[model samples]
Target chain A: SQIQFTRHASDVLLNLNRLRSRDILTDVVIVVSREQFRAHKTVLMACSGLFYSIFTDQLKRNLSVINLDPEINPEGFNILLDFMYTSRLNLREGNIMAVMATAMYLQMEHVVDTCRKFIKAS
Target chain B: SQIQFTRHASDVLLNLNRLRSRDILTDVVIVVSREQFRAHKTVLMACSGLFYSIFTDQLKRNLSVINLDPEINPEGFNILLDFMYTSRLNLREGNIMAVMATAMYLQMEHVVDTCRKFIKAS
Candidate 1:
């Protein structure tokens, strides 16, 4: 089921990527990774293989700054799991801060939410 | 024409944001944003208004590394929505790098891909 969904999603992914290009995805991925990490800094230790790789080094640097239990970050994991299947994702307000924290902890610095006034202004 | 699109987009943006929450969106948005920024760092200042806000300060810093003209990155904005309206966007190989660069320069790290091995790996 997940694999099937993954295949269908690629079409949207390809079209979006094609119309929008690469720079944006890179920026969002990095920032979002950092955002989620902040909320669950030490949690990555529990992650394995691909999870470890996606979190990277820079992500770890930011994650170190925070102080959260490793066990309570299923949200972060879900974000990463989704990423494993889909490359580009959206950014809505509401819980944007939490997700951003995850990315920050992981040091996906390129996508950190340092000055995202638009998330509100928009 | 674009205004109507923007308004309707906010709806999709809202639902995607909720069902997935900020984590999935942040992860995808941050990653996608970084991907786009690399291709159009200088273009943000030229974008004005909403574009400026969405790009953010960190987003700006990342945008500076590239050499593309400000007028050229209209594509980056679209990707932002592609991600914004739908928290999960797909990533194509060659282009994923482009969007990531743009996002990096813009500094929307919540979504960059400094270590987006999966961009190709997946």
Candidate 2:
């Protein structure tokens, strides 16, 4: 469970399942959205969706870019799907490859940044 | 499955269920314990027994070292018991504290250190 900070569109998901994720993302988004008041929801929404469109494929078949059809591995797709829905990730090597594949497919900059941290660790 | 790293003693367990665990620890121990023991039974004998003792009633007995009793938390005892037999640990915040407390009680300095490291990440 996590403490939800409200936003105009939807509540910003603070992923404790991924350590330092909420803080790191919050810092970056807040800088862009400039939420000065308490309970600032709209500004938060703006940030969560920022640059969100760049990842889309727009095949007219499925608009969901995150539900990406990765050419690499299916296990990778499962890992990213899990992350998108649950925000938790396993710190295993092979699973990391799966996660990285998903992040790369969508060009998920933030996710890529997060994965990079573990690359250093590995 | 992980590429098994053989050792002089019992073969160590590889927790590959992890993207997973079997790999990270494998490299460290395999590198350090060059003899490469494959024994996967996560630390046993007296040190482990003491860890369980303190972690059981030994974790938080009556509070003070003199009053430490394994009879304290009946509910938490069950979890500790399971951990004793298996390396499984509850990720819940409350349970995690109990586990850490117990780890400290028995003077499992390494366990305590590991728990601390997890606190930052987990």
Candidate 3:
């Protein structure tokens, strides 16, 4: 009977806020367009297989700054981050392309498919 | 345009899993019965007024074990946790009363009212 689920993004957002504010258990720093964002490698790894491959035993770059792709704009990445954190994607006319591209690159199937649906609808 | 929020408890659940596994950004340790749940003070505070009062700056008992109310069962607590994380609650024959009671105690108006609707329908 619990089939309907309301996917609140607060917890994911809350944890990130907590990690950033308390500076606890954060092991990775990423630089995107000269702006640094602190993050937990484990959190990102769990969300994306690409991140899993890069952050896991394959790499030893703990607490190190990794330069993100220039094509991945901060705004676009924020959307991706929101999806990764909460599985909620806000797709609009202006941001749809960037979000879809990033979602495709990240190999996030849900986001990719959701973007596809929105595109088809429009 | 994103009016319908899925309220996936996955993100919050995922963050909690990450925190527990990595022991990162965890500031509160709660003991319910014999089990211990490692959690973020910020998380509890943000979700519940009761938690806000207990975990706020007024209380500096970080890393301390607080015995939750014995009336609150672990299963009911988990349902509350899921609701907190995803804004979703499962109400059925076995667990409805416990959930409603706990939700009322926690002052979670949404869950409390949801239970009210469910009980009336049943």
Q: Each prediction's TM-score against the native? A: 0.25, 0.27, 0.58
Candidate 1 error regions (>4 Å): A1-122, B1-12, B15-72, B119-122
Candidate 3 segments exceeding 4 Å error: A3-28, A39-46, A53-79, A82-122, B1-28, B38-47, B52-66, B85-88
lDDT of each: 0.38, 0.36, 0.64
Query: How many backbone clashes are present in model 1?
Result: 123
DockQ of all models, two decimals each:
0.02, 0.01, 0.21
For model 2, residues A90-110, the per-residue Cα lDDT tens digits are: 546767766675567555566
Docking class of 2: incorrect
Candidate with best DockQ: 3
lDDT of 2 by residue, B57-99 (tens): 5234222222234433433444443333234544466666666
Q: Locate the minimum summed-lDDT window of 10 residues in model 3 chain B.
A: B3-12
Candidates 1 and 2: which is better by TM-score?
A: 2
lDDT-wise, the better of 2 and 3 is 3
Give a tens-digit lDDT track for model 1, residues A5-75: 22222333333333233233232222233244222211232122323444445555333343334633446
State in Å the error of residue A119, model 1.
36
Instruction: Choose 2 or 3, whichever is better by TM-score.
Output: 3
Candidate 3 is scored at a TM of: 0.58
The clash count of every prediction, one per candidate, is: 123, 21, 6
